[PDB]
Design an enzyme around this catalytic site. Structure first.
Site, short mmCIF file in Angstrom:
data_model
loop_
_atom_site.label_atom_id
_atom_site.label_comp_id
_atom_site.label_asym_id
_atom_site.label_seq_id
_atom_site.Cartn_x
_atom_site.Cartn_y
_atom_site.Cartn_z
CB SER A 71 -0.54 1.73 4.41
OG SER A 71 -0.18 3.09 4.58
N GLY A 79 0.80 -1.23 0.00
CA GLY A 79 0.00 0.00 0.00
C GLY A 79 0.83 1.27 0.00
CB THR A 80 -0.12 4.85 -0.62
OG1 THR A 80 -1.18 5.06 0.33
CG2 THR A 80 -0.71 4.53 -1.99
CB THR A 81 4.17 6.21 2.37
OG1 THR A 81 4.98 5.47 1.44
CG2 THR A 81 4.93 6.37 3.68
#
Ligand SMILES: [Cl-]
Ligand SMILES: [Cl-]
Ligand SMILES: [Mg+2]
Ligand SMILES: [Mg+2]
Ligand SMILES: [Mg+2]
Ligand SMILES: [Mg+2]
Ligand SMILES: [Mg+2]
Lengths: 196, 241, 226, 250, 204, 244, 231, 195, 243
Positions: free
Chosen positions: I74, I29-31
């Protein structure tokens, strides 16, 4: 029943008579109506003895489980738990409870929960059958930020009059003092308060 | 080989999921120790905060179950807190129903019975934790009762749990072989804590700072955990003799 | 019914009369009103007699299982808590009014409990239709630091007041003494002040007085072999 | 969630074997030896207190348990399974008998109730069998003294004397040579101690041996006086000292 | 309207020397109307006898229920139920209907087969046990029976003397009750023989 | 999820057989042999206990023969614990019928009820079947003396003479050879014991390895008596019939 | 592979294959386009027939006077999800006298789809949805995936060959967002967008399905000769 | 409904039941048959609250017919009456009890005996030589007590029944529009079409 | 083998592989990050701009619980939403019974027990999210991070997602260089920088920054989104630091 709780400079004091009647018969003349639900959160009970005991036991359980998880509960939290039980079960309960407690952040606090299950935060509260006769006296004589000795005298004199006129009230005057110093129990006998 | 996936018997009469739950117990790489005094029960546990971004005050494996009962856990924190919440609920319900504080040994038995159920019922997994319950019981006095993933439990004069439990156990055994009594003959809990820390140092062969340890103390009518500064005072006394 | 409980130096005593009635009729003249919850926790019941018996035996059963589970001797506060929560749940419909007394590792205890589930603590208590007669005696003669002998005397006197003055009470006095560090001693028919006098006449009939239509043997035995 | 294992985990194999029951019996075989001997005026049940650690207080672990005032039980196999069975057995003695008839169940019927519970763990959904064999000794007015064995399958058999667990085969042969129908309770205790010594490796004394009897009524253990018909429990657990006294006359 | 006095009837039990007696009238009615003169109210399960007064549908139902239960008892216990044990079973069974009870007045009579001790017991509709040494009464003429038994009874009567006492107690009580009578039965019970006697009485 | 571990106890094989029923029957084939023989004046139930011990308390022991009511008894072959579950259910059904109709339950109605319970476990619920075969010996005033058997499938049949458990093939051939319709109970007693004596896997047939019962109108007049034989009585009948 | 038997199983790389297979059903579905300006929002959908005797499967469903969607994938799943939206829009109007915000409608669809991805016995929904609506904050377009992911967009396309339409909308972004107060030109842009996804077949009178909602325009669907104007 | 009578003679049971159905102000029917055949040799008559009477009777009939098919056997009159009693005893503690009183007349083919059972809505069962429900017994029982013999023929039973109906027609305030009379014996159930 | 095919099964190691596979979804996932400041907390998240067609500032990721708690996560976004919905129910029932708003440590355990419950059975799947959350209560500021296993601890700074290693290093510098503490306004600026720095692991596509905060002095202890001028100021500060 004559019960009351009064906030003062160092915290709060709960007061109560000791008479429990079945009609005109005094079933218990030395009743303890001042009830501990937490270390420094107590309550005064009026109405059905069965109901107020059942409620108080459940509250004590709830606050014990609260304390294990979240630490010491506020007096407001204790009043809220009382209110939840009284309001949601209003059809099946006859209970008039005064909740009094001492925090270090909030100091002395008094909440009254009458028959309907509403909550009212007050500087002091009176309840029970005997309270009717001392509305005039208590309103005229209460001051905020009294000393411990003044508050003991105010409650002693108030409940003295309630006992004098109300047949359902009598026996000894019990008191519980809630401050930073701890918890102190007081008792006053007829020969003391009747001559006031 | 699905007899290894759920809690049913292997051909040898073994429960592999229970055995593997015992192995999960050492995943934290933390050792704990419990000893009894005259008036108290002390439990100590290693504290490791490997990340600098962590708030060290929230890193704990000791729990205050009730006013009188304390619990240290050997195993992963999710299962630890699961057991902690349940133990707190059981202790509160007990007091409400029976009108007196739940004894340490009775709570241990109750949690052991719950653990036993997970070893017999297939839909529930064992918790990968070993639970050490401590108190000063109003009838039995200082008490140590330990529960495991098999649903086994027993009282202890003293006990140790973790990867290096054997070293600590043998060290404790040797001391009680000398003294020939079932407890630490000491008046104050402060000195019982000092004994506990000293013998963990001896057994593990490692020194401790104030942030390397975690201490719980049970006395009559209350269990409490020590602050880092309370532990520091303990460590200073140990070094000064 | 008259039942009392009295605290003393090293324990507690409970007592009761032995009359049970339907309306104005005496059903049993030697009724046992002292019930055992556990070896050293006893209670006396007034109100609906089946309810006082049933609620005693249920809590007594659960107390025994609790004692086995916890490896500890039962406590009076446990019996009290279990009784009141059961009675409260049934909102007074279980007509059990009890005086609960006993000794345990914590000490000696005396409580009363009403059918709605309200409880009381005291050094002396009375319940039942003869409770006012009994409480009159208790209020006249009770003092702090009673001996075992004084408490038994006071308790049985309080029951006697009920026996003689309350029409709902009569016959004999039953007593149970629970002392700390001792076996509870149940004193069935401790006093017997109401033995019926000899009748003026024997009413034994001559044999063959009653007219009979038929006679037959009743087979109470099972089906026989051969 | 919900228990989604509503199907049997014990099933018949092609050869007609119920695998999980056989494997439960294998777990019992690994268990510490326990035994029972019936005399004319009593029954004795005994086992070794195999302490897991010397720091453990083995007096807090009861292998011999009172079920009713006149019925006791001992086991071989998985301790935790035994402990929960004792809890269920104590309760069922009340719920399915004492609360109905106002008296404790006879030995054979309590055994029957325990057996039923163990049978159900062999057929009910999502459970394994209990990994214990029980020896239940008891007395009741109309049947006298009796001793029963209950297995993981739920099968139960009455015995004059028997042993289960580790060294049962050798122990049963030892009991066959010594048992007769004229034994007094003290003779049975003596034989029990002799039999148990063979299967014990280490220490053999009152602290490492657990032994209880079903014998005479104990009015001293009743807790109250005043009711002539109540005469006290027949179950009595022997003390550490009482065992050691009989180990000198061994 | 009152369920316990719709059908009418009485039962009385007495103890004697090494014997017990239990007796009942034979009337079943619908208030004023007499319906049956053959409605026996005493039953037995092995050597234990049970009389039941009150609402007739419940009398029949409970007999069937206790036959049911004592039959299962015997199969499992491998012995006949005793009077003391059965008394507890009646009490348990009645109290399970605490808030919807059977409107009955049961009476147990029998001799314990092992001790030889004579036993009698009475119950209210809700299971409370009255275990009297002397006599138990039940039914719409229970007041009358209490009066008869209290004066006529004396302890340790021989079986054939006990018969006369209990018979006269029943008969004269029933004759002062509108809803009892129309015949009567007396059981004389000894350890291993029971005699049943039908009495001749007025039929109004 | 859970499906992975499901044995599916209630499915047909490609040949149209119920796996678990077939395997339960295999289990029963290793149980001690039980035999029932119906005569004109009564029924005989004879059964072999499985390899016993000298320390077993025989006089208080029951693994084969059970009483359902005063008129009906059963012989068990298979898992004893499974059988007791069904036996208690059958005892209750009998009493339910007696309470409802005020008449003793007819033998077949009881048998059908128990057999229907067995059937249910083969069609729904996903549980293992009961590993039990019963021989029912009973009397009612409609059909008189009756013998039935039921097995884990829930199928039941009536018999003049029948065996269940071990060596049923050998036992049934021996019964078929010597059975006659006009036979009497005392003759049937002998046939049952002779058949067990020949089919047993033990070296010799003795009293301590047997359970024995008769249902006779040898009860004084118009009624039926059940007789569960005592150990000494089994020893006597073994001598009488000349087996020991 | 060994981890695609049910929705309750992660793969060793942290993938949910049953959800990915449900996503694959959308890719097999017929193309549908969504786009909006500041006054109006438009759905354009290429309907698919079974053969020449058959009807063309309807793609657009009305949820309320101010909201509706188009579907691609399993049509019965779209019926279940659109019915749920109808109820939620309805609950908002009846209880709160309030038209359900399009963004809140997306949140509700996300949560409903999520429950079918974390539990045993169930399966993911096998349909993608494009929700358009006009509420108190103007025109809106949402894209729903049965993974639970809901995204607010100016324009998009789902179904087979949707990539061509999506690239076109990405080029035209600055033009079609400005088409305010002109419904016909916004639909034209949508019809031109969906044309970038056609091969072999072209837009006919029973092939094309168009929906529009806006400032003073209730959600209305155009089929048959009503879309001949745009062919 | 109103009057239902029963008399057990030497070899048969005779049930007489009124024909009137009255709904308050008007007599709606004067040919109502207040009876159901439960099995070939068992008949049940009934009276009580409207609707419940027929509903209960047909429910019992359905159950006895089901038993007959399952077992290929006719239950004895005693067994049927016990089944009916249990249903009513169950019913009296229901939410809404069946307000139905019944007479069960059966011929036991095994014992070769007629049998008459009287059961009220509470589940009160009695076996009688003659019986009734409601007020019917108040007018008729004094006549039956006088004339009844256990060895009466069917014809004598019908004559005694006629005297009972005549006394009812004289002293009862309500017009019950005569009775339908049915006989139960070894050959089954038949209706007397002239009474 | 086969121990990794079913949730709640212990491997011979004593591991729950299904939980470990859920972590892989989180790492994909994204930060997202969290910074604990002097009188509150700051949350920030990287939002990948997959296409130009995404409406800017509309697809909001950070979620509020009650009025004083912020949550960011995330991994699988729907799983995070499910967890927050549960959290909102937990917070509502707590306030209903006890009146006071749920304390942050109390709230942390509610989420923790719920996530841990999804590792007890094979009929459920573990959560495919790591959740960073916190706020202000009566005892001050609290920051927590919760993993798929149910494990959570209190943090000074927290990071998860694809660029967590980069972010953690940046957070560790702030802890070392500011033992006295960081102001709320400083934390917002630093949060913007750290997300921009952590975007190197996701450098293919451009992104949108989203920040929120609860502060006793700046927001009265209520959770608020950083908007307009304050957000632009943080973006400028971040862009200056990467160049
Ligand atoms: Cl007020
Ligand atoms: Cl438990
Ligand atoms: Mg006064
Ligand atoms: Mg499991
Ligand atoms: Mg109330
Ligand atoms: Mg009369
Ligand atoms: Mg008359």
């Amino acid at each position: 029943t004559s019960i009351m709780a009064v906030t003062f400079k160092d915290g709060v004091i709960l007061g109560a008579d000791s008479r429990t009647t079945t009609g005109a018969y005094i079933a218990n003349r030395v009743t303890d109506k001042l009830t501990r639900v937490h270390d420094k959160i107590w309550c005064c009970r009026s109405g059905s003895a069965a109901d107020t005991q059942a409620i108080a036991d459940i509250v004590q359980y709830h606050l014990e489980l609260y304390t294990s998880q979240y630490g010491t509960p506020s007096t407001e939290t204790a009043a809220s738990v009382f209110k939840e039980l009284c309001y949601e079960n209003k059809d099946n309960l006859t209970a008039g409870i005064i909740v009094a407690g001492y925090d270090d952040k909030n100091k002395g606090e008094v909440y009254t929960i009458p028959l309907g299950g509403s909550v009212h935060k007050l500087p002091y509260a009176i309840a029970g059958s005997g309270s009717t006769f001392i509305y005039g006296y208590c309103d005229k004589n209460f001051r905020e930020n009294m000393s411990k000795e003044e508050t003991v005298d105010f409650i002693k004199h108030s409940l003295s009059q309630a006992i004098k006129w109300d047949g359902s009230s009598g026996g000894v005057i019990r008191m519980v003092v809630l401050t930073a110093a701890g918890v102190e129990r007081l008792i006053f006998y007829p020969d003391e308060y009747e001559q006031l | 080989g699905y007899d290894r996936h759920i809690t049913i018997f292997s051909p040898e009469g073994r429960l592999y999921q229970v055995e593997y739950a015992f192995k999960a117990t050492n995943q934290t790489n933390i050792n704990s120790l419990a000893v009894r005094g005259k008036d108290c029960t002390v439990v100590i546990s290693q504290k490791k905060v490997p990340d600098k971004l962590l708030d060290p005050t929230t890193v704990s494996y000791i729990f205050c179950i009730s006013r009188t009962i304390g619990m240290v856990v050997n195993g992963p924190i999710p299962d630890a807190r699961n057991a902690a919440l349940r133990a707190k609920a059981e202790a509160a319900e007990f007091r409400y129903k029976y009108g007196y504080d739940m004894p340490c040994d009775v709570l241990a038995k109750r949690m052991a019975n719950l653990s036993q159920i997970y070893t017999q019922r297939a839909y529930m997994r064992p918790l990968g934790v070993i639970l050490t319950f401590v108190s000063v019981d109003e009838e039995l006095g200082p008490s140590i009762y330990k529960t495991d993933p098999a649903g086994y439990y027993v009282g202890y004069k003293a006990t140790a749990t973790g990867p290096k439990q054997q070293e600590i156990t043998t060290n404790l055994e040797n001391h009680f072989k000398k003294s020939k009594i079932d407890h630490i003959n000491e008046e104050s809990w402060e000195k019982v804590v000092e004994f506990a820390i000293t013998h963990m140092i001896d057994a593990l062969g490692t020194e401790f700072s104030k942030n390397d340890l975690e201490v719980g103390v049970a006395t009559k009518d209350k269990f409490f955990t020590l602050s880092a500064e309370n532990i520091e005072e303990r460590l200073v006394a140990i070094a000064e003799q | 019914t008259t039942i009392v409980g009295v605290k003393f130096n090293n324990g507690v005593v409970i007592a009761a009369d032995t009359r049970s009635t339907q309306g104005p009729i005496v059903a049993d003249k030697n009724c046992a009103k002292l019930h055992r919850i556990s070896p050293k926790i006893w209670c006396a019941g007034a109100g609906t007699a089946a309810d006082t018996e049933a609620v005693t035996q249920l809590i007594g059963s659960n107390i025994e299982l609790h004692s086995l589970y916890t490896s500890r001797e039962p406590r009076v506060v446990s019996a009290l808590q279990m009784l009141k929560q059961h009675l409260f749940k049934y909102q007074g419909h279980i007509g059990a009014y009890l005086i609960v007394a006993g000794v345990d590792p914590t000490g000696s205890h005396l409580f009363s409990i009403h059918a709605n589930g309200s409880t009381d603590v005291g050094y002396y208590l009375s319940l039942g239709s003869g409770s006012l007669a009994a409480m009159a005696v208790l209020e006249s003669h009770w003092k702090q630091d009673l001996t075992k002998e004084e408490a038994i005397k006071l308790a049985s006197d309080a029951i006697q007041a009920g026996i003689w003055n309350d029409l709902g009470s009569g016959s004999n006095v039953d007593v149970c003494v629970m002392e700390i560090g001792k076996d509870a001693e149940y004193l069935r028919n401790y006093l017997t002040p109401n033995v019926r006098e000899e009748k003026q006449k024997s009413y034994k009939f001559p044999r063959g007085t009653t007219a009979v239509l038929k006679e037959s043997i009743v087979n109470i035995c099972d089906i026989q072999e051969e | 969630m919900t228990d989604r294992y509503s199907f049997s985990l014990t099933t018949f194999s092609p050869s007609g074997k119920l695998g999980q029951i056989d494997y439960a019996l294998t777990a019992v075989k690994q268990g510490v030896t326990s035994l029972g001997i019936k005399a004319t005026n009593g029954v004795v049940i005994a086992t070794e207190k195999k302490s897991s650690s010397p720091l453990a207080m083995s007096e807090t672990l009861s292998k011999v348990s009172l079920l009713t005032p006149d019925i006791g039980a001992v086991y071989s196999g998985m301790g935790p399974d035994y402990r929960v069975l004792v809890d269920k057995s104590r309760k069922v003695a009340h719920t399915s008998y004492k609360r109905i008839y106002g008296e404790y169940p006879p030995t054979k019927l309590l055994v029957s109730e325990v057996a039923k519970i163990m049978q159900e763990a062999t057929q009910s959904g999502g459970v394994r069998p209990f990994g214990v064999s029980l020896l239940i000794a008891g007395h009741d007015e109309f049947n006298g003294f009796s001793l029963y064995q209950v297995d993981p399958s739920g099968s139960y058999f009455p015995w004059k004397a028997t042993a289960i667990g580790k060294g049962s085969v050798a122990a049963k042969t030892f009991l066959e040579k010594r048992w007769n129908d004229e034994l007094e309770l003290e003779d049975a205790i003596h034989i029990a101690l002799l039999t148990l010594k063979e299967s014990v490796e280490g220490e053999f004394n009152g602290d490492t041996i657990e032994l209880a009897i079903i014998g005479d009524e104990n009015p001293d253990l009743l807790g109250y006086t005043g009711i002539p018909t109540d005469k006290g429990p027949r179950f009595r657990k022997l003390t550490s000292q009482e065992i050691n006294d009989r180990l000198e006359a061994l | 309207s009152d369920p316990s006095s719709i059908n009418g009837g009485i039962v009385v039990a007495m103890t004697g020397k090494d014997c017990v007696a239990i007796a009942c009238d034979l009337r079943l009615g619908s208030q004023s109307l007499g319906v049956s003169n053959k409605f026996e109210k005493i039953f037995h399960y092995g050597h234990v006898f049970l009389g039941i007064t009150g609402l007739a549908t419940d009398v029949t139902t409970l007999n069937e229920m206790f036959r049911y239960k004592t039959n299962l008892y015997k199969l499992k216990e491998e012995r006949a139920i005793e009077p003391e044990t059965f008394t507890q079973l009646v009490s348990s069974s009645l109290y399970e209907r605490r808030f919807g009870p059977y409107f009955v007045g049961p009476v147990v009579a029998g001799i314990n087969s092992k001790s030889g001790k004579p036993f009698i017991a009475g119950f209210d509709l809700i299971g409370c046990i009255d275990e009297a040494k002397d006599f138990i009464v039940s039914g719409t003429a229970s007041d009358q029976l209490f009066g008869m038994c209290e004066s006529l009874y004396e302890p340790n009567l021989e079986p054939e003397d006990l018969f006369e006492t209990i018979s006269q107690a029943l008969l004269n009580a029933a004759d002062r009750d509108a809803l009892s009578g129309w015949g009567a039965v007396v059981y004389i019970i000894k350890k291993d023989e029971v005699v049943k006697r039908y009495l001749k009485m007025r039929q109004d | 999820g859970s499906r992975r571990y499901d044995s599916r106890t209630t499915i047909f094989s490609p040949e149209g057989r119920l796996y678990q029923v077939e395997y339960a029957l295999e289990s029963i084939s290793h149980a001690g042999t039980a035999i029932g023989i119906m005569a004109s004046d009564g029924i005989v139930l004879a059964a072999e206990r499985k390899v016993t011990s000298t320390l077993l308390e025989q006089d208080t022991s029951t693994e084969k023969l059970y009483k359902l009511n005063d008129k009906i008894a059963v012989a068990v072959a298979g898992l004893t614990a499974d059988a007791e579950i069904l036996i208690n259910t059958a005892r209750i059904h009998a009493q339910n019928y007696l309470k409802t109709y005020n008449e003793d339950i007819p033998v077949e109605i009881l048998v059908r009820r128990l057999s229907d319970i067995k059937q249910g476990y083969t069609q729904h619920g996903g549980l293992r079947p009961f590993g039990v075969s019963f021989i029912y010996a009973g009397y009612d005033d409609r059909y008189g003396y009756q013998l039935y058997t039921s097995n884990p499938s829930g199928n039941y049949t009536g018999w003049k003479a029948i065996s269940v458990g071990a060596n049923t093939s050998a036992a049934q051939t021996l019964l078929q050879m010597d059975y006659k319709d006009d036979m009497k109970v005392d003759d049937a007693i002998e046939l049952a014991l002779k058949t067990l004596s020949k089919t047993t896997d033990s070296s010799a047939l003795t009293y301590d390895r047997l359970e024995f019962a008769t249902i006779r109108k040898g009860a004084n007049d118009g009624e039926v008596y059940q007789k569960i034989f005592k150990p000494q009585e089994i020893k006597d009948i073994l001598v009488k019939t000349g087996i020991t | 592979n060994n981890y695609d038997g049910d929705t309750v199983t992660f793969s060793p790389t942290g993938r949910l294959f049953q959800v990915e297979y449900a996503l694959e059903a959308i890719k097999q579905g017929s193309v549908t386009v969504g786009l909006r300006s500041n006054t109006h929002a438009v759905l354009v959908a290429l309907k698919r027939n079974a053969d020449e005797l058959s009807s063309y499967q309807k793609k657009i469903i009305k949820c309320d006077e101010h909201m509706g969607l188009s579907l691609a994938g399993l049509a019965p799943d779209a019926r279940v999800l659109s019915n749920y939206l109808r109820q939620q829009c309805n609950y908002s109007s009846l209880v709160f006298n309030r038209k359900l915000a399009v963004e809140r409608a997306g949140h509700l669809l996300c949560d409903k789809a999520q429950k079918n991805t974390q539990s045993y016995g169930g399966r993911p929904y096998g349909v993608g949805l494009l929700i358009i609506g006009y509420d108190k904050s103007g025109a809106h377009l949402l894209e729903f995936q049965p993974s639970g992911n809901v995204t607010e967009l100016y324009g998009t396309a789902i179904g087979a060959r949707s990539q061509g339409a999506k690239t076109y909308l990405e080029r035209t972004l600055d033009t079609f967002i400005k088409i305010d107060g002109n419904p016909d030109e916004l639909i034209k842009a949508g019809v031109e967008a969906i044309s970038q996804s056609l091969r072999d077949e072209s837009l006919t009178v029973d092939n094309l399905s168009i929906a529009i909602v806006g400032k003073d325009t209730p959600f209305t669907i155009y089929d048959g000769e009503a879309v001949a104007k745009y062919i | 409904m109103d009057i239902i009578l029963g008399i057990r003679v030497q070899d048969s049971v005779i049930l007489a039941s009124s024909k009137a159905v009255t709904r308050g102000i008007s007599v709606l029917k004067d040919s109502d048959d207040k009876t159901r055949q439960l099995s070939p040799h068992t008949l049940m008559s009934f009276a009580g609250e409207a609707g419940d009477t027929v509903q209960f009777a047909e429910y019992i009939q359905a159950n006895i017919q089901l038993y007959s098919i399952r077992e290929d056997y006719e239950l004895s009159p005693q067994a049927v009456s016990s089944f009916v009693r249990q249903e009513l005893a169950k019913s009296i503690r229901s939410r809404r009890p069946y307000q139905v009183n019944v007479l069960i007349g059966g011929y036991d083919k095994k014992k070769n005996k007629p049998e008459l059972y009287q059961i009220d809505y509470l589940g009160t069962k009695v076996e009688l030589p003659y019986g009734a429900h409601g007020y019917s017994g108040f007018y008729t029982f004094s006549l039956l007590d006088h004339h009844y013999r256990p060895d009466m023929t069917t014809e004598e039973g019908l004559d005694l029944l006629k005297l009972c109906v005549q006394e009812l027609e004289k002293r009862m305030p309500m017009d019950f529009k005569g009775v339908i009379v049915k006989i139960v014996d070894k050959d089954g159930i038949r209706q007397v079409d002239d009474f | 083998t086969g121990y990794d095919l079913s949730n709640s099964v212990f491997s011979p190691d004593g591991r729950n592989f299904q939980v470990e596979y859920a972590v892989k979804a989180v790492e994909n996932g994204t930060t997202s990050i969290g910074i604990k400041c002097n009188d509150g907390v700051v949350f920030a998240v990287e939002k990948l701009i997959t296409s130009k067609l995404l409406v800017p500032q509309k697809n909001v990721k950070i979620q509020v619980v009650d009025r004083h708690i912020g949550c960011v996560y995330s991994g699988l976004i729907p799983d995070g939403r499910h967890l927050v919905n549960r959290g909102r129910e937990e917070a509502a029932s707590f306030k209903k019974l006890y009146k006071t708003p749920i304390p942050i440590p109390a709230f942390a355990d509610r989420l923790g027990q719920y996530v841990q419950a999804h590792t007890l059975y094979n009929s459920v799947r573990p959560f495919g999210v790591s959740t960073i959350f916190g706020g202000v209560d009566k005892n001050g500021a609290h920051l927590y991070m919760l993993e798929p296993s149910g494990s959570y601890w209190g943090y000074k700074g927290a990071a998860t997602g694809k660029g967590r290693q980069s972010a953690k290093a940046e957070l560790e510098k702030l802890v070392d260089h500011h033992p006295e503490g960081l102001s709320a306004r400083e934390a917002v600026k630093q949060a913007a920088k750290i997300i921009y720095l952590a975007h190197e692991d996701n450098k293919e596509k451009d992104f949108e920054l989203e920040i929120s905060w609860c502060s006793l002095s700046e927001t009265n202890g209520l959770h608020k989104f950083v908007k307009g001028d304050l957000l632009q100021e943080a973006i400028d500060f971040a862009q200056k630091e990467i160049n």
